[PDB]
Amino acid sequence: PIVQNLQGQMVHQAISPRTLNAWVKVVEEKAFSPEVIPMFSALSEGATPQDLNTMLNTVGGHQAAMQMLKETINEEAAEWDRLHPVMREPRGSDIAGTTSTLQEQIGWMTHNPPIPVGEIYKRWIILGLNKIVRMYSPTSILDIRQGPKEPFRDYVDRFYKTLRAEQASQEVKNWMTETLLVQNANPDCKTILKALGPGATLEEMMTACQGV
Amino acid sequence: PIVQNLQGQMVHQAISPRTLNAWVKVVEEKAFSPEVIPMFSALSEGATPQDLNTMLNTVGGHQAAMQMLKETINEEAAEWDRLHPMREPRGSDIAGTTSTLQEQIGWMTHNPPIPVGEIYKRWIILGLNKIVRMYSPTSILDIRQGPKEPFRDYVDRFYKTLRAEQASQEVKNWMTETLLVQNANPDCKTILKALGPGATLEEMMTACQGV
Amino acid sequence: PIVQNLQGQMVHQAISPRTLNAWVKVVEEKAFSPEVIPMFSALSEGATPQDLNTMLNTVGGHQAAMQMLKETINEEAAEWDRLHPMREPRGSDIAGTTSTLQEQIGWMTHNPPIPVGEIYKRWIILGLNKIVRMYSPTSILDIRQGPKEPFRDYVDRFYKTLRAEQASQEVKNWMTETLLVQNANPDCKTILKALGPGATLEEMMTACQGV
Amino acid sequence: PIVQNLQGQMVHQAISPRTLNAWVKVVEEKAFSPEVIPMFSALSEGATPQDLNTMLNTVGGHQAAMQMLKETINEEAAEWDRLHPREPRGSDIAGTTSTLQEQIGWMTHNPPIPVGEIYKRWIILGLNKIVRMYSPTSILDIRQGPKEPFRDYVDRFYKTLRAEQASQEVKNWMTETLLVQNANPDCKTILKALGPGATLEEMMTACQGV
Amino acid sequence: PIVQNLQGQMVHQAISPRTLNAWVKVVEEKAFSPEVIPMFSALSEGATPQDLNTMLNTVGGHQAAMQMLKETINEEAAEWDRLHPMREPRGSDIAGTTSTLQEQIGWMTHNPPIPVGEIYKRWIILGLNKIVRMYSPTSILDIRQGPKEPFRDYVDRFYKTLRAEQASQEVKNWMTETLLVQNANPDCKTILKALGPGATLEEMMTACQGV
Amino acid sequence: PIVQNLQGQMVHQAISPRTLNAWVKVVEEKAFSPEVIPMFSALSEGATPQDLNTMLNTVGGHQAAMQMLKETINEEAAEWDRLHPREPRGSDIAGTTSTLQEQIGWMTHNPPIPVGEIYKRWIILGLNKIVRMYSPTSILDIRQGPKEPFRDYVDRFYKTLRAEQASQEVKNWMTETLLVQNANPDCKTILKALGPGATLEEMMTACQGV
């Protein structure tokens, strides 16, 4: 993070050991289930690129994913260097915290109009984690279907946990929640859902399918 | 939360990692048992809408409940826009989706403030109440005392179910007066009906010690 | 709790997540063993009625006890409205149910203060007392020394029961004097009669090390 | 503990939940091993009598000891009321008849009237009696087994000697005399090949692996 | 670390006991898996040479590694004395063995600073790199896919080995492009050949979903 | 430790309960492995003699070692009382005959008399002697098993070498000569094929997978 000292100057605050152990436990145990993007954003709230790189590099397992993340970050950094051609201006490799010192990072993050390289880099990281969370999704939302003896609450849990991993826009996710959840239900249960009419809330749908 | 910085400005304090681990543990272990509403309300005591959204979005399980929560928030956000035609916060601003963190801190620190973190925490608690009612594992009419079950343990099950049911107080009065007696063992029920109608819960449990 | 902000303003401080995790663990592990009341009074030392309600409402188990507690708080609040016909707090205001947190701060920081957090913590401790003396597993008259049981272990059981026992200190004095001897083994009871009627517990246990 | 607010007024700081859980775990697990008194003196360092009473009242188990502790606190409080005929009474120092505001008033007076320190002395005087009673056997009964390592016998001897009540001159006599005389006949022979007053380092070196 | 006191003097603050317990657990659980380098560098962001020596010397296990580390540090310190013939630090001063920590505070806060903590943390990381390479459980050429092993798990094992593999990025490029293909199962290798040579890792893993 | 209050006065900060639990765990679990001395030094970097006495006295086990520790502290304190004829006596540096306010006084005079550092040196001298005694065998006895990995033998060799009292010239001779000569005969054939100047990195590179 960044803090201002008693001397009246901006300075680093090292990312806490408990925060790193929390992040590593999150990544290792939850294996890029979609709640990893919000835990990353929450744990990383003040992070400099030094802190962000510390969070990524301290992950031990999932090195396939951490490579796909690194390859995404490099793709975003290359796109940055295209969109932003040539306190110095940061290259993409500077925002990724690779060719920049921590004092350059704090210099940008506290400039008069700040260049928020920690936020910009945290975007590129979340863009990479999104692709990983999609890749670790057990199936596509069009394939999530209710088993012949599966409770509707458990199918709804599977549906909405898969929908979090979809790269659909919210307009398409809206259509999915409205249409696929009924379309993919178990035919007895599906008959109950259609008997509510198509506009039913999820509370009404799950109320109707209690123990069905 | 919001904190006065050393520059004197009102500034965001990030919701603690230990607070998020506590919250996510609470939700995923206790699975919308009714004590989740007061733990939520405690852990979020200072929360901006960004912090509240962080607490909700960091839950991994129970995505049926978390969607029912989001649909409740959208319903309350619409009712807010019906009630309510710096900038005026509208429903998606209270919910922290269309409002920036500095708009949220703006409203929460104006004079008089618009306490968008409190307003949103109300809409969340409304959604969590609906979930806690839906996740009640069996109805109160199904809570019965087993033939060798201590009355104290049956009462624990009965009142734990009454928390989850969200019934109105006259109906809880009727249930605690009549079902708590009538679902007891035949002998324990014989004791409890001998106490007459006015028995306090202390008196009912006192009478059934060691039955 | 209540704290003074850097602007010199009296303001509420959220009851810490570690304090609530500690309290909820204390209640649900120790099951109203008498040390739950000292832990409650420790963990709630500056608590507002909102903080006290947060501590009670976050308990998930023991909903029989938590109902007897609520039932007691309502009885003490009704007695407060009999005793007591800025706005003056009624019993439901002390209990934090009809009062806002800013009212609670106002009462707790007025001059002279109306210490509604301390008053309400009295009513909670009265309810926990009534619960502790019901979760007590047996009467002090039932605590006896087993034929091969060390006197130190019997004394541990006697005084742990005597904490949960309802009795006033004059009666506790008589119990420590008379029952502690009379319920011992005939061997220990012989040694302890040889000490005469007046012996400290240090002397009694000193005499019964090798018996 | 005691802290000064940003208003400059002296105020209470609540004894931390981790400090109470540490203390209660110490008393419950370690069962008045002598190390309990240094842990008490460490955990209670800034404690007002209300903090000290919280530490004692939360212990839960060992209610024989905790009753002996309050009985000897009352012994000390009665002696205080004899030796010192508003000034605190013994019941005020014990935190029973005094409010937290009175306790802080005394502890921050000029000169400070340190009722938390005075009461912590009475508590440690009571825990001494308890540790001396929960001691499993007399120092004179600690003897070395036929194949027991001298290092483990010394561990047992000095752990017993911590709980032993005697003065340091007596403990000097005990460490000189009994540790040798109660040693295994092999070790006892080695310790007679050493000088009569060898250091414990020398004694343990000479008997290492004997 | 170094922190300025409220009296304005620059002074050392020791690494937290929690930071040490974290480091010692990291080393002794993770046993020079490559994530030890970034945990070391994270837990020592502001460390003086005395802080760094405190981290190294508190490791109990792996005294083979800790000796290889020590004699690497001595090689870098000897090279520093070759490159560099208040007082100017020798290599043994930067290693924190011959210098006082007051000299370390001096050098690290001089203008311009002589950043002996950062220099020494480089020598430590160069030694830990050699140890992570040494403790690597097998060669990258020996990582192959089991007959029913998911490609995702094989790629995890491959890139986890490729972190400890010291080879330059030109050779990592060749290995990721051609060994990862050729060390796969015959079915999975057939899928990866059908992509042609230019596939990114995301494409390779996309293709081998459910192979 | 020593801290300055919000009033700017010099103030004791109590040694943290979590730090004491960490130290107590270190001593009970790791039983004077040589890394106990670095852990001790790290957990006590700001300690007054009262904090240091709290760290020692809260140890439960190993009362043989803790007696050796306190009686070598008495030896160092006696040597200080000879070598330095208020000025603190050795018993004051050891925190026995001095108050906490005297200890802070000496630690904050100009120039300071850093009694917490001087005493921490005497404690480390005693932990040195204890670590050298609790070492389960001498380095001459460390040998490689018939099928033991050279990396595990090296781990055992250097973990033993940490606990040796040997000077660095002797440790250089030992690491050069014994580590080779006590290696398994096939593994020793590899190491001999490296020639005399091999680094430990080279020796392990050669014997990895022997």
Residue numbers in the entry:
A (entry chain A): 1 to 86, 96 to 221
B (entry chain B), C (entry chain C), E (entry chain F): 1 to 85, 96 to 221
D (entry chain D), F (entry chain E): 1 to 85, 97 to 221
What do the authors of the reporting publication say about this deposited model?
pmcThe mature HIV-1 capsid is a conical, fullerene shell that encompasses the viral genome. It is constructed of a lattice of approximately 200 capsid protein (CA) hexamers incorporating CA pentamers at 12 highly curved vertices. The surface of the conical capsid is dense in protein-binding sites that mediate interactions with host machinery necessary for transport of the capsid through the cytoplasm into the nucleus. Here, we present structures at 2.6 to 3.5 Å resolution of CA hexamers and pentamers within in vitro assembled conical CA-IP6 polyhedra from multiple lattice contexts differing in local curvature and geometry, alone or in the presence of Nup153-, CPSF6-, or Sec24C-derived peptides.
Additionally, through visual inspection of the hexamer–pentamer distributions revealed by cryoET, we identified 4 classes of hexamer that make contact with a pentamer: hexamers contacting one (type I), two (2 forms, type II.a and II.b), and, in rare cases, three pentamers (type III). Next, using reference-based classification, we identified classes of hexamer that were adjacent to pentamers within our original hexamer particle set, which we then independently refined. These yielded reconstructions of hexamers contacting a single pentamer, resolved to 3.0 Å and two reconstructions of hexamers contacting two pentamers (type II.a and II.b), resolved to 3.6 Å and 3.9 Å, respectively. Hexamer–hexamer pairs adjacent to pentamers are highly tilted (black, gray, and white points): For example, the two symmetry-related hexamers in the type II.a reconstruction are tilted relative to one another by 45.7°. In contrast, at the most highly tilted hexamer–hexamer contacts, including those in the vicinity of pentamers, R143 is positioned below the helix 8/9 loop and Q176 points upward. CA molecules that form hexamer–pentamer contacts form a defined intermediate configuration in which Q176 is above R143, but the backbone at E175-Q176 is in the “low-tilt” conformation (third column). At interfaces between a pentamer and two hexamers, one hexamer helix is removed from the bundle and instead forms a new contact with helix 11 of the other hexamer, involving residues A204 and A217. All hexamers, regardless of tilt or twist, share the same structure in the “pentamer–hexamer switch” region.
